[PDB]
Design an enzyme around this catalytic site. Structure first.
Site, PDB file in Angstrom:
ATOM      1  CG  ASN A   9      -1.793   1.223   1.295  1.00  0.00           C
ATOM      2  OD1 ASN A   9      -1.889   1.971   0.324  1.00  0.00           O
ATOM      3  ND2 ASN A   9      -2.487   1.406   2.421  1.00  0.00           N
ATOM      4  CD1 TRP A  10       3.920   1.921  -3.075  1.00  0.00           C
ATOM      5  CD2 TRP A  10       3.136   2.839  -4.941  1.00  0.00           C
ATOM      6  NE1 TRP A  10       4.621   1.392  -4.151  1.00  0.00           N
ATOM      7  CE2 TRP A  10       4.167   1.968  -5.298  1.00  0.00           C
ATOM      8  CE3 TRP A  10       2.495   3.568  -5.946  1.00  0.00           C
ATOM      9  CZ2 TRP A  10       4.543   1.780  -6.610  1.00  0.00           C
ATOM     10  CZ3 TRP A  10       2.882   3.396  -7.242  1.00  0.00           C
ATOM     11  CH2 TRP A  10       3.884   2.496  -7.569  1.00  0.00           C
ATOM     12  CE  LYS A  11      -0.246   3.305   5.067  1.00  0.00           C
ATOM     13  NZ  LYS A  11       0.039   3.621   6.489  1.00  0.00           N
ATOM     14  CG  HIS A  95      -6.004   1.732   5.088  1.00  0.00           C
ATOM     15  ND1 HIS A  95      -5.489   2.675   5.941  1.00  0.00           N
ATOM     16  CD2 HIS A  95      -5.026   0.821   4.896  1.00  0.00           C
ATOM     17  CE1 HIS A  95      -4.236   2.387   6.212  1.00  0.00           C
ATOM     18  NE2 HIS A  95      -3.939   1.249   5.623  1.00  0.00           N
ATOM     19  CD  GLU A  97      -3.258   5.570   6.607  1.00  0.00           C
ATOM     20  OE1 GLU A  97      -3.306   5.674   5.360  1.00  0.00           O
ATOM     21  OE2 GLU A  97      -2.275   5.067   7.183  1.00  0.00           O
ATOM     22  CD  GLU A 167      -5.445  -0.958   8.633  1.00  0.00           C
ATOM     23  OE1 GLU A 167      -6.630  -0.779   8.323  1.00  0.00           O
ATOM     24  OE2 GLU A 167      -4.615  -0.023   8.692  1.00  0.00           O
ATOM     25  N   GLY A 173       1.584   3.388  18.268  1.00  0.00           N
ATOM     26  CA  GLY A 173       2.261   4.255  19.245  1.00  0.00           C
ATOM     27  C   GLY A 173       3.590   3.781  19.797  1.00  0.00           C
ATOM     28  CB  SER A 213       5.860  -3.425  11.850  1.00  0.00           C
ATOM     29  OG  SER A 213       7.195  -3.357  11.378  1.00  0.00           O
ATOM     30  N   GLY A 234       2.997  -1.116   4.404  1.00  0.00           N
ATOM     31  CA  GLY A 234       2.969   0.313   4.126  1.00  0.00           C
ATOM     32  C   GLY A 234       4.295   0.844   3.632  1.00  0.00           C
ATOM     33  N   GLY A 235       4.987   1.553   4.526  1.00  0.00           N
ATOM     34  CA  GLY A 235       6.270   2.196   4.229  1.00  0.00           C
ATOM     35  C   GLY A 235       7.288   1.366   3.454  1.00  0.00           C
TER      36      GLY A 235
END
Ligand code: NA
Ligand code: NA
Ligand code: NA
Ligand code: NA
Ligand code: NA
Lengths: 250, 250
Positions: A9-11, A95, A97, A167, A173, A213, A234-235
């Site tokens: 997911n490049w977001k 998602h 977000e 997710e 956090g 992650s 993600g990243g």
């Protein structure tokens, strides 16, 4: 034997030229389609570009969201009909977000899943619990309800072909970290819900991805858990070299 | 001496091939840029295609929405930085449909306007009152507040180059109709708030479009109104022949 699926997911990152360069660097270097399914969820601006360069490869292409009608007076919305026509394989929906910033509800997600199948594509349905819910010991009930709501009304065959991504929102956090135990427990929570609503046979076909992650030195360990069938990354999907490294486990 | 600006809002309609065929049919037939500015607000999936087909013509290209950050963890959002990178001219923000279905706020719109200027494009800022507000006799105050909130913090030069579109929401899908008299009244309300906030000199440059039911048969009558500088046109902008017919009032 559910086929593992790593979706990046490049977001909200990359222009068409950047997207093009990424696909040229990765599409011809993915592992064999029989070993792992690999895909990218790209921004709407970039999709026709990604699709053109991905043509003739095993790289699956996903949108990051779509609306639940084929066409109409919905200024700013992306049509699942158009997505299908351009050649999109999957659509990520629900998602965290979008449920957060953009107010998406279980009802919107359910409508989107139905629209995506009506347009001959497949959904990657996202779910997951907050820090508050996690601390209250209510993760299983909350996620269960999300999953059940999203799938309500789909056929058994449609459910069997869906992807669901868990997710761990609570672990974003400082003082919280997710583990393989968490991925496994929560991916099984998802599958049990599908079993309760559509039966164990269907539940055993639906892929469940972990969206927490995962790194090159750990991805294989997470994917080896019995109820984890892939990852929504993600990243680490933003660089060709990094994305390719996450396909090594096969 | 405000240049008229007709913008065709396609809303959630057209795939890239449809978008290409339209541009091929209208690009070379537009009037001189000295007479009227003509643009198309196209879906994000179609923007690169529209831009490439429109290249070298006087057809202006607009996005239908964007987020207020350039890049990041905003799954499903369209970046204003990428919109500039691909060559977009304008971005429609605050459309009635987005304030409705997606709960977009005046704060969201203000941030988007700033983001749009920070990225070197121009906003088409939408405003307009509900039927309830209209019936309460509070239209002027409501619309004035929206305009003031949307422009707050912008510079006088940015305001002069902005476009503001008044949508008579109370007369869209409510069983009520708005006329040329409503268009003039409400477009003047908008200009009067610009004058109040930024001075009459700035207000006399800002182009105020009408966003109600405008069609080839009646566009001239709306354009004659002293405070109406264009139209943000929906259905009538979907067909090539019809879009071109909206540009013959000069
Ligand atoms: Na597994
Ligand atoms: Na341009
Ligand atoms: Na309505
Ligand atoms: Na009406
Ligand atoms: Na006029």
């Amino acid at each position: 034997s559910r086929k593992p699926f790593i979706a990046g997911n490049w977001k909200m990152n990359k222009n068409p030229e950047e997207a093009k360069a990424f696909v040229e660097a990765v599409a011809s270097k993915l592992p064999s389609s029989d070993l792992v399914e690999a895909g990218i969820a790209a921004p709407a601006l970039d999709l026709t570009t990604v699709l053109a360069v991905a043509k003739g490869s095993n790289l699956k292409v996903a949108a990051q969201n779509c609306y639940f009608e084929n066409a109409g007076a919905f200024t700013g919305e992306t049509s699942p009909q158009v997505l299908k026509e351009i050649g999109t394989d999957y659509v990520v929906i629900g998602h965290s977000e979008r449920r957060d910033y953009f107010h998406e509800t279980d009802e919107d997600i359910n409508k989107k899943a139905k629209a995506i199948f009506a347009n001959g594509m497949l959904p990657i349905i996202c779910c997951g619990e907050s820090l508050e819910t996690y601390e209250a010991g209510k993760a299983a009930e909350f996620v269960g309800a999300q999953v059940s709501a999203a799938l309500a009304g789909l056929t058994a065959e449609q459910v069997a072909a869906s992807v669901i991504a868990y997710e761990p929102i609570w672990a974003i956090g400082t003082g919280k970290s997710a583990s393989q135990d968490d991925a496994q427990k929560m991916c099984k929570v998802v599958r049990d819900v599908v079993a309760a609503d559509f039966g164990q046979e269907v539940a055993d076909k639906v892929r469940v991805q972990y969206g927490g992650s995962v790194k090159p030195e750990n991805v294989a360990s997470y994917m080896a858990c019995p109820d984890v069938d892939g990852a929504l990354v993600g990243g680490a999907s933003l660089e060709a070299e990094s994305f390719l490294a996450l396909l090594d486990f096969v």
